[PDB]
Nucleic acid binder design. Structure first.
Lengths: 60, 136, 67, 36, 360, 451, 50
RNA sequence: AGAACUGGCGAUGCGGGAUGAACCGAACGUAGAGUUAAGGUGCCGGAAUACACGCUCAUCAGACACCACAAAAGGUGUUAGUUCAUCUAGACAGCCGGACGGUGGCCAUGGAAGUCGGAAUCCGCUAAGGAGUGUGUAACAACUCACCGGCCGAAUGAACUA
RNA sequence: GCAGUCAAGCGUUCAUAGCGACAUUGCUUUUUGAUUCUUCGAUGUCGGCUCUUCCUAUCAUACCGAAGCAGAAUUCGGUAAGCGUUGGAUUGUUCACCCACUAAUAGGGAUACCCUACUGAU
């Protein structure tokens, strides 16, 4: 989306970094992908794989 | 259509309604069939369910060994007695209606065959292609 | 197979990356969702739900009646 | 979608002036039960 | 159960013109040059075709398979005029026509209806308006250059160039799918009194839409009209009426050939190596010969023989493999359909029969 | 059915059951009746409704009962597993109670529908319908209690490991805090926890392995305490009944080391207590965790215990550990051979010359295919894959073989003329034949034969 | 179904792929013939002009 | 349906009830003017989109008594209340800490230590801390509120009603 | 169904003059699936097709939630009526109930030229 930047993670394995000024934009974008990688027809009690958020903080 | 039937079936003319006697081209000594049923049927009011070459049925044996008579078992059609169209361009037909017996999986009941089988069923059913003495 | 193994997979692989947050949030939402339900359900489920909520209420009434 | 039927508030006469005519008779029953 | 009929083509009446009228076009793309969106010709008969098959994965991959095609006469097509159309809050509006300074006897014979008694005065004031300067013309042209978000061109056929004898030309309008409407009308103005191929619109490995009017069959009742069984009122109770001569639209039509009149041996695949045009023995059945360009397309178009059709270039960007496969013919049957045809050429007839009593 | 029970989806409680059935029968069957309709219709309505409710109830109960194994005379092994685990009496009396309830459903059905042909009016017949439905409801809420037990056993029965006692198996047993889980996980494809506490394995855990092109299963024990020697908890009785019933070998997993919940003297007397269960089992003991101890220096009295283990006919000591592969697979091999121990035409060559087989040089010269190499033969499915998928790729049948010249390999065979297509004509020396007829026409042109 | 969202967008990405590019080259291919037809008729008109 | 008093109908028009066998009003010469009844005044429709206090926002809002009504009840939608309670000697929300012993309380067990479980269920210090609500280990362990104190400072909570 | 218990509340005020919310207990034809072939006065005229549309309280086809869901398929529930629901065997009778296919083989309701409606035509 507009005004939001993406950064593949440095020095942290299997990690991705988001940065922007609009909380609503970045959060909506974070939600879109974790809905698009959503598992169906199957048991999440046994299957694990999926992208989620480590935390939600400031840049600084 | 069922299991065992490798590849798909292309549309052919339909000659065999239910109650249609046919020959038994097997080596068990069974002589005839009387169709009661089709697997792979269409759904429509007032229809007679049709079978054709390559298709797989349930049916009886009206004449053959008495141990097998008064019992129902599956079968494959091997001769149609009605004109069809192979796309490699020709119309054709065998003379007589015939169907051989086989398990529900597709494995042939008898070990051998008498007479010609169509290219379609031959291409379709490998155990037919292995137990068959003839092709067309 | 292999009697109880989901728990084994839990201790070896975790429940999820994030399951506990969803689990908390569901119960954070359920208060609003239940009243939003019972205003909805035109016909016979506003009956069954209402009986269920009433049984919940009277059960907890027995619990506070315990002392 | 296929938005479902709306049931009337029309005149549609049974209810309205003849049934609670009988329910005025039900007020009679209320008087009959109030003696006990 | 199902319903013994469709409901889309429900007012089953006859159409108003044998020219099935284009209603839809694919919208535009204003990056390309102009490409004509339609064309039209006259259906003539059918043939049978075998074709070797590059269809990856299919049962008939790399095999010969017989299929069945149709043929249509497709002479060159001359442009005579244009119109503009502007968007409103009503729809679209014809705001100007302009014509092309010299018009054939054929189209002059179209607009008149009883020809020979006519004085044939069709455009005698318009050609006079085509003055030394064409002032009024350029006035009513640059108007359209300004306005008229979308623009069409008029065509007419050259029907004298067919075995058919009707003497009359079938007008139509055709939409363009280029940009720069100034360039569109400039292109067309250069194309005034100039004619256009069918290999200059279409080519092989193509899909088209075929819109036409069907064969008529008169007032057939329910049992053959709708295929219904035999022993207040609603409009879907399968009542008798007119069949046939409806307009229709048939789509996903795989062309195999874009023929050519000047090209001798039009029936030649790479395989036959026989100098025969596709016009088979006996002439066509109720149609004559094919000494012009043509099209060979599979399936079967709505129409009857010696009937007009209109063509559209599939109206969207198709997605199926069959829309993109690569065609390769192996053999055209060229036998007479006036009987159970056996022989392609009369020289083959001579060869297999031998010489005869009338031969000498 | 034997060796698996999975086609029992669930058993709901009584309230869920009645809610589901009554909702189904409110949904499916009609619901709208006036008084002014006829009495044949009004009787038929409630009769159909109660019949459909009984239909739903019995259709549920048949899936309940036929789903369950009917443990009586299925196997002594699995029957004893159920005996220790699943409260046999509660099981049998519960299923008998609900079967009785099915008979009660049929009885109330037949009695009410015997009545209802004499239905006269709404204040009688509607209440008759409610009466029948509430009576079967009374049976349902009479039958609440066993259903939770039935469900919780059904949850566990599907997740059982499956072992047929009649086949070759390997009954590996070890002490608490013995390392048997680590040993099993090294030898076999098995996920069993390796935290060294006593009751880590809780049930009969299965592990598979291969030897001499034969399948073999490894049945682990949860540990055993036979201190009364008559009664042990439901965890311990399982491996006991396994060692009783499974007609296969037994492997003792000994740990003569301090990392146990008990002393070493308990190990030998536990062996002596379980001695009578080694009738035809061809026992083989092995010591583990042996790298830390190196028992060659082991003391005289404990060595006397080691000799005092050895009065039974079948017994064999070995030494292995849980960091090396060779000794563990060796003991596995000879244990399988212990279990095995417990368990074509000629030509005559009719000829003077030999028919030697043809194997050309190139098949030997070529390299066996490497699955991963940076450069290797390409396995042209993978060549297809990188340009289009595996279904969409057309492949040139030309340009894959040898000819006089590869330039015209893509050439189109004409293959056809006006008539008599060419492959009945095509051979060499056709120009020679053309000359052989050229001379003939040269004869006959000049003789006036074509006058 | 014909009109499901999954099959639809899965077809839209492919339409954005090879098919539209084939058509975009086809339209230039045929524009060549469509423009040179004018040249053929115009050199015929030059044969008239002489 | 069993009885009894009275009234409306039937013979009886008319205004209103959108229209009517039973409702409201009112009983008749022909006509003009005036004023009202019952019902109504957004437009169809003659008469005000009069004034004033409140409420309500319905994924079928509701729009008339008896001329299509249901309660019991459910509802983290809104309003007006009653009665209990706490409170600048610091109300509630929110952050942090405290949240101890015999104690791992009793048999239960193979293992059960605040919670697989049955019985009981107390006392010291305490501001407060139960033989301990949930989280959970095979056991233990670790975490939280309920129970108290701090940092911020004004109101706030519970039950019930319509 | 009947009879209790528990008893939010109600009653010039009220337990006890008396009702009563929701659960609970009482067997109601048999505690170890052994079965029992129980159809016990079906007293009405429709029955069976050609064939159209509508309702959903959905039997599959869509998308979803939870369930010991490791998978396949299944068990429930939700939005869902866009599209589909068969060939035979048996009685004057609809009552009664099987074989097999398919994805399933869900439940319901609604003489005739004459004018009208419907199908088509100037």
């Amino acid at each position: 989306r507009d005004g939001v930047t993406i950064e593949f993670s440095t020095n942290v394995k299997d990690e991705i970094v988001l940065s922007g000024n609009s909380v609503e934009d970045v959060s909506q974008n974070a939600a879109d992908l974790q809905q698009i990688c959503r598992v169906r027809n199957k048991d999440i009690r046994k299957f694990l794989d999926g992208i989620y958020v480590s935390h939600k903080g400031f840049i600084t | 259509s069922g299991n065992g039937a490798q590849g798909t079936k292309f549309r052919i003319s339909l000659g065999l309604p239910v109650g249609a006697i046919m020959n038994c081209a097997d080596n068990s000594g069974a002589r005839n069939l009387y169709i009661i049923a089709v697997k792979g049927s269409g759904s429509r009011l007032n229809r007679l369910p049709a079978a054709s070459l390559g298709d797989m049925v349930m049916a009886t044996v009206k004449k053959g060994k008495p141990e097998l008579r008064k019992k129902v078992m599956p079968a494959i059609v091997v001769r149609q007695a009605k004109s069809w169209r192979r796309r490699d361009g020709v119309f054709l037909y065998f003379e007589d209606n015939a169907g051989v017996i086989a398990n529900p999986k597709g494995e042939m009941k008898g070990s051998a065959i008498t007479g010609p089988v169509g290219k379609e069923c031959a291409d379709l059913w490998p155990r037919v292609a292995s137990n068959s003495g003839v092709v067309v | 197979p292999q009697n109880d193994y989901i728990e084994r997979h839990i201790k070896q692989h975790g429940k999820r990356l994030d399951h506990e947050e969803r689990k908390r949030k569901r119960e954070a939402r359920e208060s609003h969702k239940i009243s939003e339900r019972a205003q909805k359900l035109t016909g016979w489920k506003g009956k069954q739900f209402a009986k269920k909520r009433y049984a919940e209420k009277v059960s907890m009434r027995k619990k506070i009646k315990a002392h | 979608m296929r938005v479902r039927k709306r049931q009337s508030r029309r005149t549609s006469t049974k209810l309205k002036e003849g049934i609670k005519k009988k329910a005025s008779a039900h007020r009679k029953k209320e008087k009959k039960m109030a003696k006990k | 159960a199902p319903r013994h009929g469709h409901l889309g083509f429900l007012p089953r009446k006859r159409a108003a013109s044998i020219r099935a009228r284009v209603k839809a076009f694919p919208k535009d793309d204003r990056s390309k040059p102009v490409a004509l969106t339609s064309f039209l010709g006259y259906k003539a008969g059918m043939t049978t075709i075998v074709r070797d098959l590059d269809r990856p994965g299919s049962k008939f991959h790399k095999r010969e398979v017989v299929e069945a095609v149709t043929v249509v006469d497709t002479p060159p097509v001359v442009v005579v005029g244009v119109v503009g159309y502007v968007e409103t809050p009503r729809g679209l509006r014809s705001l100007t026509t302009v014509w092309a300074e010299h018009l054939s006897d054929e189209v002059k014979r179209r607009f008149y209806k009883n020809w020979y008694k006519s004085k044939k005065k069709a455009f005698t004031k318009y050609s006079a308006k085509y003055a030394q300067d064409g002032a009024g013309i350029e006035r009513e042209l640059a108007r359209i250059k300004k306005y008229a978000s979308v623009v069409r061109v008029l065509v007419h056929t050259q029907i004298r160039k067919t075995p058919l004898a009707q003497k009359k030309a079938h007008l139509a309008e055709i939409q363009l799918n280029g940009g720069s409407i100034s360039e569109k009308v400039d292109w067309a103005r250069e194309h005034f009194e100039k004619t256009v191929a069918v290999d200059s619109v279409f080519e092989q490995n193509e899909m088209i839409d075929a819109i036409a009017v069907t064969k008529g069959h008169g007032f057939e009742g329910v049992t053959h009209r709708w295929g219904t069984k035999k022993l207040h009122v609603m409009w879907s109770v399968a009542r008798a009426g007119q069949r046939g001569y409806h307009s229709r639209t048939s789509i996903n039509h795989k062309i195999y050939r874009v023929g050519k009149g000047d090209d001798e041996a039009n029936g030649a695949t790479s395989f036959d190596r026989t100098k025969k045009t596709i016009t088979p023995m006996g002439g066509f059945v109720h149609y004559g010969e094919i000494k012009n360009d043509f099209i060979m397309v599979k399936g079967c178009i709505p129409g009857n023989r010696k009937r007009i059709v209109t063509l559209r270039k599939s109206l969207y960007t198709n997605t199926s493999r069959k829309a993109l496969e690569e065609v390769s013919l192996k053999w055209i049957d060229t036998a007479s359909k006036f009987g159970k045809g056996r022989f392609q050429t009369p020289a083959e007839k001579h060869a297999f029969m031998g010489t005869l009593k009338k031969d000498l | 059915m034997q060796l698996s029970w999975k086609d029992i989806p669930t058993v709901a409680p009584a309230n869920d059951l009645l809610d589901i059935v009554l909702n189904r029968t409110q949904r499916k069957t009609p619901t709208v009746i006036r008084p002014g309709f006829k009495i044949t219709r009004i009787r038929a309505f409630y009769m159909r409704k109660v019949k459909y409710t009984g239909e739903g109830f019995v259709e549920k109960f048949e899936d309940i009962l036929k789903g369950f194994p009917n443990i009586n005379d299925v196997h002594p092994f699995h029957r004893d597993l159920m005996d220790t685990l699943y409260e046999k009496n509660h099981y049998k009396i519960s299923l008998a109670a609900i079967s009785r309830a099915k008979s009660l459903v049929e009885q109330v059905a037949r009695d009410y529908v015997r009545l209802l042909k004499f239905g006269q009016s709404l204040f009688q017949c509607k209440q008759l319908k409610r009466a029948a439905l509430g009576r079967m409801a009374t049976i349902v809420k009479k039958l609440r209690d066993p259903l939770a037990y039935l469900e919780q056993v059904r949850q566990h029965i599907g997740r059982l490991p499956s072992i047929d006692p009649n086949t070759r198996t390997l009954l590996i047993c070890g002490y608490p805090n013995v390392g048997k889980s680590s040993f099993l996980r090294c030898i076999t494809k098995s996920d069993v926890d390796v935290q060294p506490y006593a009751f880590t394995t809780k049930s009969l855990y299965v592990g598979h392995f291969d030897y001499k092109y034969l399948r073999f299963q490894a049945i682990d024990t949860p540990g055993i305490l036979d201190r009364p020697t008559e009664e042990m908890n439901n965890i311990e009785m399982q491996s006991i009944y396994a060692i009783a019933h499974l007609r296969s070998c037994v492997l003792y997993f000994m740990d003569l080391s301090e990392q146990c919940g008990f002393t070493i003297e308990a190990q030998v007397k536990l062996f002596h207590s379980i001695k009578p269960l080694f009738a035809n089992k061809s026992v083989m003991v092995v010591i583990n965790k042996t790298d830390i101890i190196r028992p060659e220096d082991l003391d005289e009295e404990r060595a006397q215990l080691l000799e005092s283990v050895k009065e039974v006919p079948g017994v064999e000591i070995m030494t292995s550990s849980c960091q090396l592969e060779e000794n563990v697979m060796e003991v596995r091999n000879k244990a399988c051979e212990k279990l095995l121990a417990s368990r074509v035409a000629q030509p005559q060559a009719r000829d003077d010359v030999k028919r030697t087989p043809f194997i050309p040089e190139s098949v030997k010269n070529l390299k066996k295919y490497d699955p991963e190499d940076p450069n290797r033969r390409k396995l042209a499915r993978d060549i297809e894959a990188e340009n289009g998928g595996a279904g969409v790729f057309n492949v040139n049948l030309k340009d894959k073989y040898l000819l006089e010249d590869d330039e015209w390999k893509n050439d189109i065979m004409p293959e056809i003329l006006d008539g008599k297509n060419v492959y009945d004509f095509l051979d060499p020396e056709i120009a020679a034949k053309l000359q052989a007829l050229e001379e003939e026409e040269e004869k006959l042109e000049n003789e006036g034969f074509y006058n | 179904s014909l009109r499901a969202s999954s099959h639809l967008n899965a077809k839209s990405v492919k339409r954005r792929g090879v098919f539209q590019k084939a058509v975009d080259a086809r339209e230039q291919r045929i524009s060549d013939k469509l423009k040179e037809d004018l040249l053929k008729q115009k050199l015929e008109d030059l044969k008239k002009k002489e």
